[PDB]
Design a protein around this ligand. Structure first.
Ligand SMILES: Nc1nc2c(ncn2[C@@H]2O[C@H](COP(=O)(O)OP(=O)(O)OP(=O)(O)O)[C@@H](O)[C@H]2O)c(=O)[nH]1
Ligand SMILES: Nc1nc2c(ncn2[C@@H]2O[C@H](COP(=O)(O)OP(=O)(O)O)[C@@H](O)[C@H]2O)c(=O)[nH]1
Ligand SMILES: COc1ccc(N(C)c2nc(Cl)nc3cccnc23)cc1
Ligand SMILES: [Ca+2]
Ligand SMILES: [Cl-]
Ligand SMILES: [Mg+2]
Ligand SMILES: [Mg+2]
Lengths: 437, 346, 424, 54
């Protein structure tokens, strides 16, 4: 057994971490105080769930998690919330003033003054680890902390833990819930500086989650709470193989091995089904074939794009609930005939499959109905480059006028970092295009 | 009130569509780069599909189907027909064809295997070569591939149709242009009016170096042809005259001898690619206007040669057709405050 | 987090007092500083503007400044007079005679250090001061001359805080003296260099609103200040109320100001109220807040383009309807929003409505049409300045014509810079 | 279409399905970057303060 440390940076990272750790506790039967009765090995163990929880002599299961934000208001809600007892004070780190939606304020100005404290708290977690495999890093692209502090922290983690894997869960910006006009700038800057320090990055476009909430949960104006419970379902679907018995995606290295053949193209697309309203009176439960088939509708992707007009480099199917292999293979056979699924020539056309018999846990009182089976597909398709296209266009529109650049230069960043980052992104877009057309 | 944006000024059909849209007082045009449009009349090259359908509060529609190029560029279409079970290498309405790459998978080593059986069986062995100006129709291969390699792009060469149907008086060749509009629901609509692009020079089966009685391009006929327009204004015979001719001279209708095959071919092609390009469940929607080019043989058998994805109309029919595009492709999605299309379904 | 508020001069102190009355009411605090509201939204961020004092008392973090005591006395005697700490009243005796040079160079210099002492005391009691807001007019002497002196002193001592101002622009329709264009031009030069964000409150617009649409035949300063206090409560709601968007003065500057110098905002309000019964529909609220007739800077928004817009809806209403209506405005008028700042319109909602309204909307636009305002001032300046008329009031305080030429040039430059982006 | 590496256990199973075969800077440089930005910031501040002294 090898440990995993979760790092939540900025508002989006922290509120999504709240959602995920609530879910985690519900799934492993860990009570809000940190007591897991089914855990007979008191005070320790090398069980699967121990990769995310440590244990105290008093039988308290404590997340291997650090929450970091540059202003205090959001992490203060963790400190006074239902799961306050879960986290140990040293893990919840806050500053006095935020980054003002300014990547350079988060990276350079305010980042330089809190980075060493954060690394010290992360080291205190790592020192409780017999064999740390690495880190799961949650953050927004658009926030000043989310982008700027995150990239600084990634650089330093590559330094202080060179052989360890680093995974991202990244919130891509959408105008319907965005908070800042400069989110494209911050997105490009943090992606350029982080690219080489991340082994695998799961992008969630708030636009897609927003629309999923509206169409399938009949939420008229989704809040961060709605979005985050849905996102935390997807995240749990992705990390279940690190927290449960199995043979697929058991360590972080396997994510890269199975999903990222070319190291720069490390942005797997996530598609999830079924999303069903708790207020659906009569629901007819969906078969393996129906949920698997729904994994190929753009409307269920974490990022709206069209995988028909791209190529696949890898594809993983993570099921939860009442599923057996033959029904999976039966669904795949038919789907292959009715759908445009093209793999790159140097890759095998195939699916790695993982099944966990326990169906998804749902937050009591939440928006999601219990279902007898669910699936999350992780596919590395070049189609996701569409999202970079969108972002790089918005960036180009502002930067051609140097609009807002003065706020970044005034924090000590050089204008050249802008065009450097944009050039890296142009390289990325070309990599995708040549791999996929 | 609806907004559109015009990114292909060099398109006659959509120029006329812009005018018709403005003339309704319910459409206003925006600057080419303004992303708050309902309607995009896109550029022909590298249209940015990846940026469509991410504008909240805007239903967005575009006049091209992403992926339809597989039908509309010559090597692509041959690959699609051969490899697609719906059409198959046994397809009976598409001529034998092969994809050849210049000197600088290919298919000339599979070509020759058939060409020499044609030459031994003492069959007509004329073959035509072209890509997507620079055409060679020859009788022996070493002229064909020799020409292909002087150019530098991928080429297709296919069994020339040695026994076409010839219009009298004149003993001349022709191709049939059908216009087909696929709307956002993937209804396939064939325009009632086709056109017969004729040649003005009786058909000389002797030397295939004279392209004036073997290629039916409206361009190569106005400039380099003797009597461009002696039989029909602009070398364009429409459907009423042509049906009349088929009745008088051959004792059939255009509908029975030819149009049935044309509707079958159109529906087959478009239904075959429907799963690859449909926008039925997409965050943006597509429609597209296609030009199917057909050649009839002396047995009243129809053949498909090119599908063009950005066709122009015949000056006589611009008005009616563009108004039809507005009615069935655009107002269907964006409503305002006896149809000229035949719907293909079976 | 904490904001330090400064009101300077007659106009600055009269609108400052009204602002504190209005937002003290909105937060449940009474003239004695004792909280008496019911909800708890009212207190979550109460410290951005108020200090807590002995006995659960709330004391505005506000310094009152003047060169003559008249209007200060009027405040102390006024409704909320006793809610301010008496030590924060800083005044001289000789006045400034509507003379920028007296405020900035002679009389004001004599008083400015003790104001900065009170500023220092208020700021060292702050956990993380985000910056300052100043209410003043530009047409008189104390607000314009000594307020801009204060601003550049505050900037010297606190170069990393935000400077925000509510600046009342003079108009001949509401005019105290003929030298107002001089004072205004001198002040704009200062503001363009030393504020991060300035709300341009045009006494012309305020007059036209009271006259042409509130049907007030003889508008008083009270009728004008009712509009100003509605607008000020509106534009600070996201600062002092917990919402989804946890806004502050710096984030507002970052998102609203694409180039340092173009930081002059057109504010707007709806429904326009006089000192009614029909509830407004969200579509109505939205059409009115964008209406030229609802804007407090006398400029035609159709004469320029919006660089950025922030919009606040107050009341219980349909978030969904708000989104739809805001998108409808942008999609139906996209001509007027620059296309090189994507998604340059942001919206926020607060459940708490202002007093006497079930719903309202406040508008904050950074438009290139603001250049009209400065052109107006510039014309009135030159008309006198070409004959050096009334200059002796200024040379008698040590000023040189060269300084008038410099401020005029800088304001004309500001106008050209706006015109540069009206056509990009 | 063949089914390989089936591994299975009481919480679930995993396996593979093939349909077709195949047709960083140092701590030094980082603290240098951070301090270079701090220097540009301190310089802009000194420019501002000198202008205000004028
Ligand atoms: N999905 C989701 N997105 C969020 C959430 N909170 C913020 N965001 C998105 O994140 C972006 C804003 O960045 P934040 O994470 O809030 O800002 P920050 O990282 O705290 O950095 P600062 O600028 O210092 O405040 C916008 O695109 C938001 O819509 C959340 O809880 N869930
Ligand atoms: N809107 C408004 N404008 C005012 C008020 N008092 C004065 N003014 C305007 O402010 C300018 C005069 O400056 P004033 O504040 O009286 O002089 P100061 O005391 O030297 O700062 C003129 O343009 C007046 O119309 C007021 O209460 N409201
Ligand atoms: C156009 O892009 C933006 C993005 C954000 C912001 N912020 C920071 C805001 N700040 C404050 Cl104090 N009030 C507001 C009221 C309404 C909307 N936003 C804000 C403003 C413009
Ligand atoms: Ca244990
Ligand atoms: Cl290591
Ligand atoms: Mg934040
Ligand atoms: Mg006065």
């Amino acid at each position: 057994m090898r440990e995993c440390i979760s790092i939540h940076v900025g508002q989006a990272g922290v509120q999504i971490g709240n959602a995920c750790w609530e879910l985690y506790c519900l799934e492993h039967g860990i009570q809000p105080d940190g007591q897991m009765p089914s855990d007979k090995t008191i005070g320790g163990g090398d069980d699967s769930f121990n990769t995310f929880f440590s244990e105290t002599g008093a039988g308290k299961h404590v997340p291997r998690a650090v929450f970091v934000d540059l202003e205090p208001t959001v992490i203060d809600e963790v400190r006074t919330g239902t799961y306050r007892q879960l986290f140990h004070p040293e893990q919840l780190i806050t500053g006095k003033e935020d980054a003002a939606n300014n990547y350079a304020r988060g990276h350079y100005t305010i980042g330089k003054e809190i980075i060493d404290l954060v690394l010290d708290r992360i080291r205190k977690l790592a020192d409780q680890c017999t064999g740390l495999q690495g880190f799961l890093v949650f953050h927004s692209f658009g926030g000043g902390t989310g982008s700027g502090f995150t990239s600084l922290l990634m650089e330093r983690l590559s330094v202080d833990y060179g052989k360890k894997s680093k995974l991202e869960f990244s919130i891509y910006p959408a105008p319907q819930v965005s908070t800042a006009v400069v989110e494209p700038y911050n997105s490009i800057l943090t992606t350029h500086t982080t690219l080489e320090h991340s082994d695998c990055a799961f992008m969630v476009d708030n636009e897609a989650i927003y629309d999923i909430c509206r169409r399938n949960l009949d939420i008229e104006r989704p809040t961060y709470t709605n979005l985050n419970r849905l996102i935390s379902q997807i995240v749990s679907s992705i990390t279940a193989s690190l927290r449960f018995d199995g043979a697929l995606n058991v360590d972080l290295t396997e994510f890269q091995t199975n999903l990222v053949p070319y190291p720069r193209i490390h942005f797997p697309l996530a598609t999830y089904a079924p999303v069903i309203s708790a207020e659906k009176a009569y629901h007819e439960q969906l078969s393996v074939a129906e949920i698997t088939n729904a994994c190929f509708e753009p409307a269920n992707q974490m990022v709206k794009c069209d995988p028909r007009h791209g190529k696949y480099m890898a594809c993983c199917l993570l099921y939860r609930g009442d599923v057996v292999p033959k029904d999976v293979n039966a669904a795949i056979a038919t789907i292959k005939t009715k759908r445009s699924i093209q793999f790159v020539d140097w890759c095998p056309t195939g699916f790695k499959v993982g099944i966990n018999y326990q169906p998804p846990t749902v937050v009591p009182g939440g928006d999601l109905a219990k279902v007898q089976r669910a699936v999350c597909m992780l596919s590395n398709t070049t189609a996701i480059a569409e999202a970079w296209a969108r972002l790089d266009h918005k960036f180009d529109l502002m930067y051609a006028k140097r609009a807002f650049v003065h706020w970044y230069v005034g924090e000590g960043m050089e204008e050249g970092e802008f065009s450097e980052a944009r050039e890296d992104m142009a390289a990325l877009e070309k990599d995708y295009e040549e791999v996929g057309v | 009130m609806y907004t559109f944006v015009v990114r292909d000024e060099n398109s006659s059909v959509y120029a006329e569509v812009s005018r018709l849209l403005l003339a309704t007082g319910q459409w206003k045009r925006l600057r080419k780069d303004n992303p708050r449009f309902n309607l995009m009349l896109g550029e022909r090259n590298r249209l940015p599909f990846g940026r469509l359908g991410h504008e909240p509060g805007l239903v967005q529609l575009v006049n091209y189907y992403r992926g339809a190029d597989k039908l509309c560029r010559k090597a692509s279409l041959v690959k699609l027909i051969k490899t697609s079970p719906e059409l198959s290498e046994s397809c009976t309405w598409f001529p034998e064809s092969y994809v050849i790459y210049p000197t600088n998978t290919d298919e000339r080593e599979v070509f020759l295997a058939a060409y020499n059986r044609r030459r031994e069986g003492r069959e007509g062995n004329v073959w035509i070569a072209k890509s997507s100006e620079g055409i060679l129709i020859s009788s022996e291969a070493s002229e064909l591939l020799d020409f292909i390699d002087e150019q530098g792009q991928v080429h297709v060469i296919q069994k020339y149709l040695e026994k076409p149907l010839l219009l009298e008086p004149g003993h001349r060749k022709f191709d049939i242009r059908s216009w087909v509009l696929v709307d956002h629901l993937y209804n396939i609509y064939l325009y009632r009016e086709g056109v017969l692009r004729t040649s003005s020079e009786p058909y000389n089966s002797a030397n295939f170096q004279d392209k004036t009685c073997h290629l039916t391009n409206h361009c190569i006929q106005k400039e380099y042809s003797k009597n461009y327009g002696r039989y029909e204004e602009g070398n364009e015979m429409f459907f009423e005259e042509f049906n009349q001719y088929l009745m008088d001279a051959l004792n059939t209708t255009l509908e029975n001898s030819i149009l049935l095959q044309i509707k079958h071919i159109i529906r087959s092609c478009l239904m075959c690619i429907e799963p690859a390009i449909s926008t039925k469940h997409l965050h943006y929607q597509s429609f597209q206007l296609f030009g199917f080019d057909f050649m009839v043989d002396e047995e009243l058998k129809v053949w498909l040669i090119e599908v063009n994805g950005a066709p122009a109309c015949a000056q006589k029919l611009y008005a009616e057709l563009c108004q039809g595009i507005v009615d069935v492709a655009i107002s269907s999605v964006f409503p305002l405050a006896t149809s000229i299309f035949i719907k293909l379904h079976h | 987090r904490e904001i330090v508020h400064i009101q300077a001069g007659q106009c600055g102190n009269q609108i400052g007092a009204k602002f504190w009355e209005v937002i003290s009411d909105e937060h449940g605090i009474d003239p004695t500083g004792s909280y008496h509201g019911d909800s708890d939204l009212q207190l979550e961020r109460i410290n951005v503007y108020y200090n807590e004092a002995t006995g659960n008392k709330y004391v505005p973090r506000a310094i009152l400044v003047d060169l003559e005591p008249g209007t200060m006395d009027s405040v102390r005697s006024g409704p909320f007079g006793q809610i301010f700490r008496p030590d924060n009243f800083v005044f001289g005796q000789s006045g400034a005679g509507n003379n920028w040079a007296k405020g900035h160079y002679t009389e004001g210099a004599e008083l400015v250090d003790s104001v900065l002492d009170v500023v220092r005391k208020e700021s060292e009691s702050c956990d993380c001061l985000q910056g300052f807001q100043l209410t003043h007019s530009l047409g008189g002497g104390t607000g314009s001359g000594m307020g801009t002196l204060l601003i550049s002193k505050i900037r010297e001592e606190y170069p990393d805080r935000i400077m925000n101002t509510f600046s009342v622009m003079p108009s001949p329709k509401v005019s105290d003296t003929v030298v107002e264009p001089y004072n205004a031009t001198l002040s704009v030069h200062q503001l363009v260099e030393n504020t991060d964000e300035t709300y341009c409150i045009d006494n012309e617009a305020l007059y036209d609103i009271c006259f042409r649409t509130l049907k007030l035949t003889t508008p008083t300063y009270g009728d004008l200040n009712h509009l100003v206090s509605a607008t000020m409560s509106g534009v600070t709601t996201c600062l002092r109320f917990p919402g989804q968007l946890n806004a502050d003065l710096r984030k507002l500057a970052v998102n609203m100001v694409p180039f340092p110098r173009l930081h002059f905002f057109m504010p707007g309000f709806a429904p326009l109220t006089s000192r009614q019964y029909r509830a407004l529909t969200v579509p109505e609220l939205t059409q009115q807040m964008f209406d030229s007739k609802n804007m407090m800077a006398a400029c035609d928004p159709r004469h320029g383009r919006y660089l950025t817009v922030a919009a606040i809806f107050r009341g219980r209403m349909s978030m969904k309807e708000v989104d739809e209506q805001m998108l409808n405005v942008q999609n139906k008028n996209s001509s007027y929003f620059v296309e090189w700042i994507p998604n340059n319109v942001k919206t926020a909602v607060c459940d708490i409505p202002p007093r006497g309204l079930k719903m309202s909307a406040t508008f904050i636009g950074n438009s290139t049409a603001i250049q009209e305002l400065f052109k107006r001032i510039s014309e009135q300046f030159t008309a006198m300045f070409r004959r050096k008329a009334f200059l002796h009031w200024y040379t008698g305080e040590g000023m040189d014509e060269m300084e008038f030429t410099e401020a005029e040039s800088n304001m004309n430059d500001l106008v050209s810079e706006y015109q540069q982006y009206q056509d990009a | 279409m063949e089914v390989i590496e089936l591994n299975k256990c009481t919480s679930g199973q995993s396996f593979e399905v093939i349909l077709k075969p195949p047709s960083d800077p140092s701590l030094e440089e980082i603290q240098k970057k951070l301090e270079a930005a701090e220097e540009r910031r301190k310089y802009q501040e000194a420019e501002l303060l000198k202008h205000l002294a004028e």
